[PDB]
Design a protein around this ligand. Sequence first.
Ligand SMILES: Nc1ncnc2c1ncn2[C@@H]1O[C@H](C[C@@H](N)CC[C@H](N)C(=O)O)[C@@H](O)[C@H]1O
Ligand SMILES: Nc1ncnc2c1ncn2[C@@H]1O[C@H](C[C@@H](N)CC[C@H](N)C(=O)O)[C@@H](O)[C@H]1O
Lengths: 224, 224
Amino acid sequence: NSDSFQKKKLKSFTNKYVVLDSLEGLRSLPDNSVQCVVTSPPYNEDDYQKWQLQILNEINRILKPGGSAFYNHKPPEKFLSDSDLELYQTIIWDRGSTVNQNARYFRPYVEKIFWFTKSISGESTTPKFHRDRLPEYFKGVIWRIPPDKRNKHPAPFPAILAEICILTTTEEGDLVLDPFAGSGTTLVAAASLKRSYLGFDISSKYQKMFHQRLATSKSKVHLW
Amino acid sequence: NSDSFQKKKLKSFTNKYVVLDSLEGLRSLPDNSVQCVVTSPPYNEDDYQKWQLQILNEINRILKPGGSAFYNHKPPEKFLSDSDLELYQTIIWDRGSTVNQNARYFRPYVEKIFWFTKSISGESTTPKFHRDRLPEYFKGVIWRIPPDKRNKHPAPFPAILAEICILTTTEEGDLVLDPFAGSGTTLVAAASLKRSYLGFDISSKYQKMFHQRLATSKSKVHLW
Ligand SMILES: Nc1ncnc2c1ncn2[C@@H]1O[C@H](C[C@@H](N)CC[C@H](N)C(=O)O)[C@@H](O)[C@H]1O
Ligand SMILES: Nc1ncnc2c1ncn2[C@@H]1O[C@H](C[C@@H](N)CC[C@H](N)C(=O)O)[C@@H](O)[C@H]1O
C-alpha cells in the first residue's frame, strides 16, 4: 500500500516543482521510477556525509535500471563510494575562470560531476547513454561551460549542463528529477527537451522563481 | 646510526638512477631530505593499495616540510586519503585525445595528478609553491599536454609535465625524486632545470635508456 501511495504521489508530482524536504520527497517516489537525476547538493561534516549517503541510497532505489544520476559536488570520493549507487565516471566541468586567484594553488576553475548508475543486488550495469546526440564539443570527459552569470540564484549550474545529462540518458517523456531544484535549471532543461520533470526544494521563493522562469523562457534548447 | 647510513646513501645516490626496489630505496633515504617527488606508479587489488600506502607513507617521511609529491594515477581517492601524506590539490592532466572511442562513456582523455604535501604530527601545511614561474597556460588546475608519443617507454609522462611540478616547488640544487623512474623523464627534467635528481626503478633496461637519453638530450627546457 506504500507502493500505491508512492505511485499516486508520482502522478501528482509529475511536471511539478514540489516544496518539500529532499529526503522526504525521495522517500515518496516508487522504486524504479526515475530515468535521470541532475542535481547539485547544498550546504557537522560527518552528519553531512551521512545525510548525503541517505540521499544517494534513495536515488539508487528510485532510479530505473540503467538510469543515471549526475551529482555536481561543489575527499568527496571517499564517502561517495560508500553508497548503493555505482560511480560510473567522473566528468570534469571546466568553468573557464575563477575569481579566486590565490596563488597558493593552481587556479581552481574545475568542478566535478559524478555520474552514478543504479546497482541491483550489488551488481553493476551499463547506463542508457547516447553520446551521438551531443555535438563533438561535449563528447569528452571535460565540458568547457562558462557559469550562468545572469542567474539570480546564489549557486546554480547552467542549463546546457543539464541538457547534456538529460539528452544522453533519456527519451522524450522520461522523468527527470532534481531533489535540490533551486532556480529549476534542471526542470526547465527537461521541459525544453520534452522530458517530464520533478523538483524538490524547501524554498517557496525558489519555487516561485521557477514558475516565473518557466513562463518567460520560450523552451529554448541551448544545446546544438 | 641508521641516520648516518641513510645520509651516506643520500650522497651516494645524488644525481643517480639507482636500480632498486622502490620501497627499499625510499627506506634508505633520511627524513626530510627530498623537496619534490614526481612519479607515476606501475601495475591483488587490496594488496596493491596496501603497497601504495607504504610508498606514500615513506614519501611523507622523506619529504622536507613544505615539500611536494606529485602522483600521477593511471575510487583512487578512497585509499589515497588513508596516508600520512596530505592531499593538497587534484590537478587534471588533459591529454587532448584518446584512442579509446568506446561510446559507453565520455571520451576518457584525462588523468589525475595528485598533489600531496608533508604532514607533521598530523598537521597541515602550505607547500612551497611559485605559480608565477609558469606561463599563464599552466597556472590553472587543468594542464593541456599531449602525450609524449616519441618515448619508447610503454607508459611515460612528458617532460614538460615534470618541469611544471619541479619548477614551482624547488630551488636550483634541490633534490627531485622519482621512485618509479622508468625512462627517467623526471630526472632529465630536474637536470635540465639545474635541480638534483634521484630515481629508483627495477629495470636495468630503463636505467641504460636513461643514461643514453641523458647523454643525447641537450638539457633543453620544454617550458617557457
Ligand atoms: N534539505 C533540503 N531539501 C531540499 N532542498 C534543499 C535542502 N537544503 C537546501 N536545499 C536547496 O538545495 C539547493 C541547492 C542549490 N545549489 C541547487 C541549485 C540548482 N541546481 C540550480 O541550478 O538552480 C538550494 O536551492 C536550497 O534551497
Ligand atoms: N617495485 C618496483 N620498484 C621500482 N620500480 C618499479 C617497481 N615495479 C615497477 N617499477 C617501475 O615503475 C615504472 C612505472 C612507469 N609507469 C613510470 C614511467 C616514468 N614516469 C616515465 O616518465 O618514464 C616502470 O618503469 C617499472 O619498471
